[model samples]
Target: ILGDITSIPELADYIKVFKPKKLTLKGYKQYWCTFKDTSISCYKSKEESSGTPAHQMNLRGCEVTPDVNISGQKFNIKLLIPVAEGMNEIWLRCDNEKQYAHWMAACRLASKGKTMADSSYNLEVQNILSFLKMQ
Candidate 1:
C-alpha cells in the first residue's frame, strides 16, 4: 500500500471522505473509493432499495461520462500536471464486471475527470508520490 497518508496534507481526509471502492495497488490496502460520508457519496434512498452506497461520478464536463451510477471522487491536478491555469486531459481507466477499456474520460480544464480504469490519467503522477489527503 501507500506510505502513510498522514504526511500528505492534501489527501488528509481521503479515507474518511469516501468508502473505499477498491484499492488500486492490488494486494495492498490503501483503498480508493468515493465519498459516501460527504454529500457526494449518497446513501441509496433508504425508502427505495437496500441501504447501499449511492453510486455515481458526475461528468460535469467529461467525454462519455457513464450513464450508470459511477460513484467517484475528484482530485486537484494543479500540482500533478505541468499545465497552466486551465484544466487538461484525463483518462478514466476502468475495469468493471463488464469489459476492459469500457470506461475512459477526457475532460477539459474546467471539468474534473474520473479514473475508472485501474490506472491514473497521468502515468507520471506515480513519480510525484508526494500527495496530501487526510483520513
Candidate 2:
C-alpha cells in the first residue's frame, strides 16, 4: 500500500551558462550553475559535477532584484541572501535578457518554497517573466 508522500520534488534542474560573483568581488568568473531544489549549485564544468558544489546559495528568505547598472550588453540579477551578521549580495550575469527573466522568476518562486509539483508552476513562471517585460 502506498502511504502519503508529501515530499515536494525539485523545481528546475539544468546547466546555466552564466557568471556568479559577490558584490565585493571584482572579476566575474564563469560557472556551470544548476538551479535545483531551493539552492543554486555552481560547478566548474559539467564533467566535474559531483556531490560537492563549489558554491551553493540557499534561496530561503533571499531577496532577488535586477541590477540597475547594465554590464555591456548582458543582464544581471542581484540577490540579497541572509547571513549570520546581516545580508550578502550576490550578482549573477546572464547571457541575455531571456535568461535573466527565467532565472529571476525561478529564484523568486524558489524563495517562496514553490516546487515543480505545483499545478501552476509553469504558469507562474510565465506570468513573472511577462510582468518583467514591462520594466
Candidate 3:
C-alpha cells in the first residue's frame, strides 16, 4: 500500500520543478505532479497513471515556506519534510507568480492535512494565496 496511488484527487498538473532523487539533487526536472490526501506524487508523464510514482512525498508533518532570495529570479516554495534522521529540504519552483501562489497555498494546506474537498478549502487557499502575493 505504500507506493499505491489512490483515485482521490485535489490538484494535478505538469510543471517544471525540482524533486531530488534520493533526496540529493543535481537540478530541476519536469514531471506530471499531483497533490491529494496530504501527499504529493510525480509521474514520468500524465498518461502514466497506474504504477508507482516516480516520487512521492507525504506532507503530514512538513513545513512550507517561501525563499525570499530565490524569488528575485525564481518563485520558490521550500518544503521541510520530516524524516527519520531529521528534515529533508526540497524546493518546488513555479513558472510564474500566479502558479507560485496556488501551489504554495496548496502545499501549506496539504501539510496541515487539509484537502480540496473541504468546503472552506478554496476560501482558505485563496486567503493564503493573497497573503503570499503581498509578500
Candidate 4:
C-alpha cells in the first residue's frame, strides 16, 4: 500500500494494460500494418472476432460499414480498419461494446490460459510490436 509505483511492493499487480499498447507483447501481428512477414497472416484462420459484417455491424463510435468487414485475414495489408469522427485505432473487447478488453478476453479464454489466443486483435498487437522491435 503505497502510492508511487516505485514505492509499492506489488506494483506489477496494480498496473493495467493500455490499448495502442506500448511495452508488453501484444501477441498476434498487426503484421498487416507495414506489409511485412508474409509467413503468418492474421486473417487466414477462421477468425471468430475479426469484426462482424459491415452491414450487420452497428456503428457506435466509428462509421463502420456493416457490409465491409476486414477481408484481410493474414496479410490483409490492403484492408483498412474503419474509423469514425472520434475514432483512431480499433478498440476491441468481448461484450456487446467494441472496446479493447472485449476482444482481448476472447483470445485469453481461447488460448486456454496461454497467450490469450482467441481474437486476431491481440495477435495483431503482437505483430505490431514484433515489427517495431525488428527496427
Candidate 5:
C-alpha cells in the first residue's frame, strides 16, 4: 500500500461527498472546516479526515457561548460548547469578530435541529464564493 488513495472507492466517495471548506483568516492558520447535518467539524489540514476531529460537535442538547475575556490567549474569540452529557466543556478559538458571530448563530441553529443554510454566516460565505465564481 503506497497510500494510493484512489485504491479505496469508499474513501474516495466520502471525500467527494464531504469536501472541506477552507476557512482561514489573516491572523489564523488554515482550518479545513465542514458542516454536516449531524455535526460541525474542524480539521487540522487542508484535506478532510474523519478518523479524528480537531474539533467535533453534534446538535444534541448542545449549548453555544462566547468567551472573550480569557487571559493569555493568541485568539480573542472563543467558542464554548457544553453538551447534555455533562462532559468537560469544549472550546474553539477564532480571531475574527464577524466570523465568530456567524459561527455562534450557526451553532445555535444547529443545536436546535435547524439548518444553517439560511444562516447569516452561511449566506455570507456562499454569497462571497458565488461572487468570486460567477458564471
Candidate 6:
C-alpha cells in the first residue's frame, strides 16, 4: 500500500506532473510493459484481450508478490498499483517465469533512482534519521 495518500496537505503536495519513462521489454513476447523513474506500467497489445492499462505505481510503497494466483494461473508479478484514488492490482505475466529476472532488475534500477520523499518535511525527517543512525 502507498500509505495515507489522503492525509494532510491532502493531494496537492503528492501530485507530480506526468512524465513517461518507458523501460524497454527484453525477451517477453506476451505483453508490453514499461518502467518510469518511480513507477512501472503495463499495457495491453491488440494481440491480447481488452481493457488496456494505465496500471502504474510508485516502487517505494507498492506491494509486489511474485508467482501468485492470477486469472487461475501464475503470473510473474502481482502488483498493487498505487493511485491518488487509492490502489488497484494487476497480474503481470511473462512467457517464461525466468524472464522476470530481467524485468525485476529493471524495476530495482528504476526504484532506487526515484525520490521516496521529496518534500521539505520529508527532507527533515531523512536528515534526522541520517544523523541518528548514520543513515
Best-performing candidate as measured by TM-score: 3
Name the candidate that leads on lDDT: 3
What candidate 6 gets wrong by more than 4 Å, as runs, is: 1-30, 46-55, 68-75, 108-135
What does the lDDT come to for candidate 6? Answer: 0.42
Write the candidate numbers in order of decreasing lDDT.
3, 2, 5, 6, 1, 4
Supply the TM-score for candidate 4: 0.17
lDDT of 6 at 5: 37
Q: 64-83, model 3: which lDDT tens digit per residue? A: 98864434756778898997
Q: lDDT of model 6 at residue 54?
A: 36
lDDT per model vs. reference: 0.28, 0.64, 0.72, 0.26, 0.46, 0.42
Kindly indicate the candidate among 2 and 4 with the higher lDDT: 2
Model 3 whole-model lDDT (C-alpha atoms): 0.72
> lDDT tens string, model 2, 9-128?
342333343333457435566777767666888777777667587678887788878663343644677778786788767777776555666676667776687644556556765775
Worst 10 residues of 4 by lDDT: 31-40
True lDDT of residue 52, candidate 2:
80
Give the per-residue Cα lDDT of candidate 2 at 61. Answer: 81
| Clashing pairs in model 2, backbone N/Cα/C closer than 3 A | none
Give the residue spans of candidate 2 off by over 4 A. Answer: 1-25, 68-72, 116-120, 128-135
What lDDT score is found at residue 16 in candidate 4? 18
lDDT, candidate 4, 1-135, per-residue tens:
545433321101111111354575553332111011111112222343254321121222232111112232121111112345433333221111132232322223322322222255456445543443322
Tell me model 5's lDDT, rounded to 2 decimals: 0.46
Better of 1 and 6 by TM-score: 6
Across 16-132, the per-residue lDDT of candidate 5 in tens digits comes to: 112234493333334555556536666666565655866566754566554543243222223344566544344445444444444555555666766554445466445533433
lDDT of 1 by residue, 1-135 (tens): 375432221111112112232353322112232322111222334343244544333433433332223334333211112234543332233333122111221222113444322144333233222221233
Cα deviation at 122, candidate 3, in Å, is 2.7
User: After best superposition, candidate 3 residue 85: deviation in angstroms?
Assistant: 4.5
Give TM per candidate.
0.21, 0.67, 0.73, 0.17, 0.48, 0.40
